[PDB]
């Protein structure tokens, strides 16, 4: 008891400092950044806010409860106040409440007091200049609080932050005018709590009412604030719309646009994983392997944790349907390994041309196939076994009888033996010629050609268009 009682005081001071000065220096600094320059945007505290939010998402967040200085909620949410020279007095009032909190119990517990608190900014009337400061002062307690998952009486409080964000959405439909240099930070912050829309709604069932609401927000941002807005909202669309049918494959067709410019960073890569599974549902394997590889290869630096391992998991699925895959056991991480353990023997069965080896993988690992969600291609891969199996033996064997190859091709009668190779040439597999009497399959090859034209002529536009973009970057980054 004395140890646990005296170890309570040490923890709070760290949130009492960094959690106090995180939105004070970044948010209060963004106030001066939003007064001037305006360049145009930047607003580097918006990306610094991303660093602080992602910092809280690990440790320590805020609430929950923690029983440490719950008076931080009324601190920033009250006392604009009101015009800038009067706000300076309230900038001293934060220090006044620092002394009040340094004297008495400092209101270490709020809970049901969030009802007057969250409505106090509406009692001030008003900030009135910066809506992102009002939305952030209310959300910063509540957004990390969603990670508690208590599911009692505070879920509707998260919904109240969603209503405050809807007031942020109506103001996202009006002012402008003109260059709402704060709406990019509103795109950032709202995309977060739009994913908190996803989490809080997923506590019970699908959000479908918010699918029409997301389409209302996604379409009302057109065309003005779509920049960096439409990208995050399209992932908010694509993610759960990939979980719930339907039509998103043809919906993103008419939705594009592209939509440029890609922001922010890994956002477009993960979008190419989301739409990567989409474009993989059309089964064209050149665009699917390029969108899946570009999804993972374009994503630094992690941690955390396993979904960046999931894009790598589903990445080589289209490579399994290509007919040739390397053994990936050397790419296993300490985490991704234990997650894909069935998928290991799966791609090992894809390398081999044995049917029973692949079918036993299906019967045993079908439970993990339910966990991943990819099924339909597991039964049709038997056609990849007959095409890779015939690619194997044909190129392999000098002249193979249709009765001897019939074991690995499982039928290979005297009739279909013609089509196996012939319709493989239709798919561009093997050139083997067969004169059918008994018969026997005599595989030869003569090709000397290509390896030339498209690679070098494309490399011209590749390199040139690249260095042109690198011009568009460097030439435009010299403002300082």
């Amino acid at each position: 008891p004395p140890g646990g009682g005296e170890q309570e005081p040490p923890p709070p001071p760290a949130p009492q400092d960094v959690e106090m000065k995180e939105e004070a220096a970044t948010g209060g600094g963004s106030t001066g950044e939003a007064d001037g320059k305006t360049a145009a945007a930047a607003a580097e505290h918006s990306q610094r806010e991303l660093d602080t939010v992602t910092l809280e998402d690990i440790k320590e967040h805020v609430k929950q409860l923690e029983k440490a200085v719950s008076g931080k909620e009324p601190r920033f949410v009250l006392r604009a106040l009101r015009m800038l020279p009067s706000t300076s007095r309230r900038l001293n009032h934060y220090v006044l409440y620092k002394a009040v909190q340094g004297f008495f119990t400092s209101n270490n517990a709020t809970r049901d007091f969030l009802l007057p608190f969250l409505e106090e900014p509406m009692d001030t009337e008003a900030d009135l200049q910066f809506r992102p400061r009002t939305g952030k002062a209310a959300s910063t307690p509540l957004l990390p609080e969603v990670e508690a998952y208590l599911q009692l009486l505070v879920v509707i409080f998260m919904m109240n932050s969603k209503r405050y964000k809807e007031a942020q959405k109506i103001s996202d439909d009006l002012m402008q005018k003109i260059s709402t240099q704060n709406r990019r930070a509103l795109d950032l912050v709202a995309a977060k709590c739009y994913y908190y829309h996803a989490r809080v709604y997923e506590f019970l069932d699908k959000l479908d009412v918010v699918r029409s609401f997301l389409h209302a927000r996604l379409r009302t941002a057109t065309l003005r604030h779509d920049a960096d807005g439409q990208a995050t909202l399209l992932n908010l669309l694509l993610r759960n719309y990939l979980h719930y049918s339907l039509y998103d494959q043809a919906e993103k067709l008419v939705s594009k646009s592209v939509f440029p410019e890609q922001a922010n960073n890994n956002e477009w890569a993960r979008y190419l994983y989301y739409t990567g599974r989409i474009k993989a549902i059309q089964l064209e394997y050149s665009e699917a392997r390029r969108t899946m590889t570009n999804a993972l290869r374009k994503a630094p630096q992690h941690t955390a944790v396993g979904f960046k391992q999931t894009v790598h998991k589903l990445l080589i699925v289209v490579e399994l349907l290509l007919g040739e895959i390397p053994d990936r056991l050397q790419f296993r991480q300490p985490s991704l390994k234990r997650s894909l353990m069935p998928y290991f023997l799966l791609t090992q069965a894809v390398r081999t041309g044995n049917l029973a080896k692949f079918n036993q993988v299906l019967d045993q690992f079908g439970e993990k196939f339910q966990a991943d969600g990819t099924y339909t291609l597991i039964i049709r891969l038997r056609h990849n076994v007959i095409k890779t199996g015939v690619r194997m033996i044909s190129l392999s064997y000098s002249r193979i009888s249709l009765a001897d190859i019939a074991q690995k091709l499982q039928l290979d009668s005297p009739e279909d033996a013609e089509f196996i190779v012939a319709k493989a040439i239709r798919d561009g597999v093997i050139e083997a010629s067969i004169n059918h009497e008994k018969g026997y399959v005599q595989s030869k090859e003569m090709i000397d050609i290509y390896s030339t034209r498209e690679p070098q002529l494309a490399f011209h536009q590749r390199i040139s268009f690249c260095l042109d973009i690198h011009n568009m970057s460097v030439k435009a980054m010299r403002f300082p």
Binding site: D57, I58, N235, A299, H302, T303, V305, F307
Partner: peptide, 24 residues
């Protein structure tokens, strides 16, 4: 990041090759 997506979730052979001789 931690932002965005990720926080959501013939043998060798020894014996058989030596046996091929004495098989036939």
């Amino acid at each position: 990041m931690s932002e965005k997506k990720q926080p959501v979730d013939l043998r060798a052979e020894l014996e058989k090759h030596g046996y091929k001789m004495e098989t036939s």
